[PDB]
Design a protein around this ligand. Structure first.
Ligand SMILES: CC(=O)c1cccc(N[C@H]2[C@H](N)[C@@](NC(=O)N(C)C)([C@H](C)O)[C@@](C)(O)[C@@]2(O)COC(=O)c2c(C)cccc2O)c1
Ligand SMILES: [Mg+2]
Ligand SMILES: [Mg+2]
Ligand SMILES: [Mg+2]
Ligand SMILES: [Mg+2]
Ligand SMILES: [Mg+2]
Ligand SMILES: [Mg+2]
Ligand SMILES: [Mg+2]
Ligand SMILES: [Mg+2]
Ligand SMILES: [Mg+2]
Ligand SMILES: [Mg+2]
Ligand SMILES: [Mg+2]
Ligand SMILES: [Mg+2]
Ligand SMILES: [Mg+2]
Lengths: 88, 119, 101, 73
RNA sequence: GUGGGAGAGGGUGGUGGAAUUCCCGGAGUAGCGGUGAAAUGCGCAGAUACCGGGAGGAACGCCGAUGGCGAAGGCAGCCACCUGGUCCACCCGUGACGCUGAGGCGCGAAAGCGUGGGGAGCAAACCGGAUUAGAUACCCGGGUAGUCCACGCCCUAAACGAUGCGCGCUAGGUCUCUGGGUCUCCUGGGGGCCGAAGCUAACGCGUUAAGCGCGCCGCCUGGGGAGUACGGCCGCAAGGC
């Protein structure tokens, strides 16, 4: 599981400013976190199809948020990805 | 011919025939009887009357080993389970106690079609 | 680390030595598996509802720990190894749910 | 009718999560190692729901029975 | 985001007792079984009924529901780990980032297929008993594939609510599961029944719409011929589209 610390850590880590609990960055941040965890979980339990969907959707919601960002402010976009390590 | 005095009476009923087995204080059988043991052949074997006559024989034969007090145990349900118990009750043996020990699965083996259709 | 509750019912025939000996192995392994005993209740013997290993009684130990969940299972694989250990059970600690109260 | 008092009424403050109070759990099993129906246990969907588990733990541990023989008949 | 909640949601390992079958030991005879009757069948190399021990596979009584969870197929012993969805409160953060979705990709009961493993019970085919005018069936005794696990494949279904998804709007009453509250009631999510308005060919539906509206998808156009033929795509095959 992602410890509360694990979480907030990443939050403050991206927040656009003190108190930013849900900018597009924070969200892409956290989503990326959950994904990688889950994705890891699935390297094993390749038969846990039911959890796959969760992933399928998290990926969706993320790539859909980034779209919005890229479209809005292309600069922040680059910054976020390069940082996070998305794409490829 | 050992002289047990007090023992156990196992009544195994089914809709196909009943069968009483008189045992001793720790389980080992002294005498046994069934509807088949008595005259009754096929269908007739089930009948509660048979139960009675098998129940008696079961005890009468038990009396030989000097039986007197017995504990009844009932496995099953069917064409004359009670009768057997009642038959014993009189017989000439003191029925210390009766008990339903009929076995039941906590769902293990798919029964033959014969007994499925339910759920 | 998460908080648990180990349950151990071992042979009710161990003599003062043999018995406090298995506790040794327990207490020992407990540690080896990050088990940090928060407390314990040793009810001792109790009339088992049904025979456990032909024996109709049992010796009950109760150790509430705090350990690395990533190894809770292994902690018991070990605990079970013992021959006198006839029952092991690690329960997730839980807030006592009261009722009719 | 089934009205012979609720196994809940004849009782006090007990932690339904206590898989070791043989004293009290023993109260919810029938004349067999069977878990009494709510209509007798007098518990609630949620309570009767936990009791269940708690009783099953007891059985495993070896404290509570899985099934008793029936007397009389 | 923070703080909470319920749950047979899923994946791995572990493990508990009941029962059947088999093997061993004890005690114990003449039967057992089975049916409308029977027979086959099993039993004196000793069966059945009873007791003690062992081995193995499979399923998980009570709780259990009129219940719950899931997108669907589906999901019930207990335990730990890994993990998905979802609801409530606070109204804290982003600031239209939304809906639908041809193609794609993934999932997808049962049966079925390939390799290996397993095999207690059940049981297509089959081998027998019976019933019948006949019995390639219905009843009875056996029993192989299979049913189980792994990995790969198939992808169908009364895959049903026979009811595509999302949002807004339109009397109530009652039972119920779960969350909050100022908790003999209010409020939110979910499951049922009755019913306003309205809708419907009728039956019925009726804030869980089949009502009133907007958006996007899929689909229909008399019956048989026919889910057939041809062609193409997929599949090891069966077969699918
Ligand atoms: C007395 C009885 O039940 C009986 C007697 C002779 C023959 C039979 N044939 C029976 C026959 N044993 C039957 N199965 C059976 O034993 N059952 C547990 C129902 C067949 C072999 O599958 C049957 C279904 O054809 C049957 O039950 C129907 O027969 C009659 O209803 C029937 C009757 C009632 C009278 C005359 C001819 C008949 O076909 C039964
Ligand atoms: Mg969860
Ligand atoms: Mg705000
Ligand atoms: Mg602003
Ligand atoms: Mg299959
Ligand atoms: Mg196969
Ligand atoms: Mg069979
Ligand atoms: Mg057959
Ligand atoms: Mg399939
Ligand atoms: Mg509602
Ligand atoms: Mg009207
Ligand atoms: Mg209605
Ligand atoms: Mg035409
Ligand atoms: Mg081809």
């Amino acid at each position: 599981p992602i410890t509360k610390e694990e979480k907030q850590k990443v939050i403050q880590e991206f927040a656009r400013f003190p108190g930013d609990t849900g900018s597009t960055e924070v969200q892409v941040a956290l989503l990326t976190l959950r994904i990688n965890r889950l994705s890891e979980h699935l390297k094993v339990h390749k038969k846990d199809h039911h959890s796959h969907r969760g992933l399928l959707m998290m990926v969706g919601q993320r790539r859909r948020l980034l779209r919005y960002l890229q479209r809005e402010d292309p600069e922040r976009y680059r910054a976020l990805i390069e940082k996070l390590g998305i794409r490829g | 011919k050992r002289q047990v005095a007090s023992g156990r009476a196992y009544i195994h009923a089914s809709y196909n025939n009943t069968i009483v087995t008189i045992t001793d204080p720790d389980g080992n059988p002294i005498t046994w009887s069934s509807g088949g043991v008595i005259g009754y052949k096929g269908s007739r074997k089930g009948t509660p009357y048979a139960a009675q006559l098998a129940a008696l024989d079961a005890a009468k034969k038990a009396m030989a080993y000097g039986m007197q007090s017995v504990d009844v145990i009932v496995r099953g349900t069917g064409a004359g389970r009670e009768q057997a118990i009642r038959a014993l009750q009189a017989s000439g043996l003191q029925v210390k106690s009766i008990v339903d020990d009929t076995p039941v699965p906590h769902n293990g083996c798919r029964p033959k079609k014969k007994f499925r259709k339910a759920s | 680390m998460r908080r648990y509750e180990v349950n151990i019912v071992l042979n009710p025939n161990l003599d003062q030595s043999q018995l406090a000996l298995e506790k040794e192995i327990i207490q020992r392994a407990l540690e080896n598996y990050g088990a940090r005993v928060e407390k314990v209740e040793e009810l001792g013997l109790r009339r088992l509802a049904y025979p456990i290993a032909k024996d109709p009684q049992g010796y009950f130990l109760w150790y509430q720990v705090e350990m690395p969940e990533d190894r809770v299972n292994d902690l018991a694989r070990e605990l079970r190894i013992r021959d006198n250990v006839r029952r092991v059970m690690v329960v997730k600690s839980q807030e006592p749910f009261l009722a009719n109260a | 009718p089934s009205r012979k008092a609720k196994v809940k009424a004849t009782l006090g403050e007990f932690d339904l999560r206590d898989y070791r109070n043989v004293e009290v759990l023993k109260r919810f099993l029938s004349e067999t190692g069977k878990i009494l129906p709510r209509r007798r246990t007098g518990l609630s969907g949620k309570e009767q729901r936990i009791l269940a588990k708690t009783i099953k733990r007891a059985r495993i541990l070896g404290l509570l029975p899985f099934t008793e023989k029936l007397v009389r008949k």
